Amino acid sequence: KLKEKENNDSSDKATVIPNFNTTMQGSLLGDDSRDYYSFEVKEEGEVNIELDKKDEFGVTWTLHPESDRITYGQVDGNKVSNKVKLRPGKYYLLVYKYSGSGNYELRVNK
């Protein structure tokens, strides 16, 4: 039932994802085109970031460490996904749209 917290349009205002394997609900309607999130890895491992589109629109995501290591989501229909091996540290996850408007769910699986 966890929801994003606007305004979250910059990493300094990112919505904390408190835990792995936890669904975050958000929306990118109208001129809300960016939702920043953050999370912390405590033990090195593979993380599977999964965005589920609840409406058809053009949305993806970009991951980078708080530390040019950058990872992009891979769009496949109504899922935008990737698997990346991450070391302990804090990470920023920018969910942003490139067309249209809609609702989504986000998980950082581990």
Part in contact with Ca ion (CB under 5 A); list of ranges 9-17, 44-52, 73-81, 83-91: 9-17
Nearer to Ca ion, 15 or 71 (CB): 15
Query: Which burial class, exposed, middle or buried, applies to 36 when counting CB atoms under 10 A from its CB (0-12, 13-18, 19+)?
Result: buried
Residue 14 binds Ca ion (CB under 5 A): no
For residue 12, which phi and psi values (nearest 5 degrees)? Answer: -65, -20
Tell me which residue has tokens 């699986």.
Answer: 109
Q: How far apart are CA 109 and CA 35, in angstroms?
A: 18
Work out which of 1, 21, 42, 76 binds Cl ion, going by CB under 5 A.
Answer: 42
Residue 31 binds Cl ion (CB under 5 A): no
Work out which of 1, 30, 31, 43 binds Cl ion, going by CB under 5 A.
Answer: 43
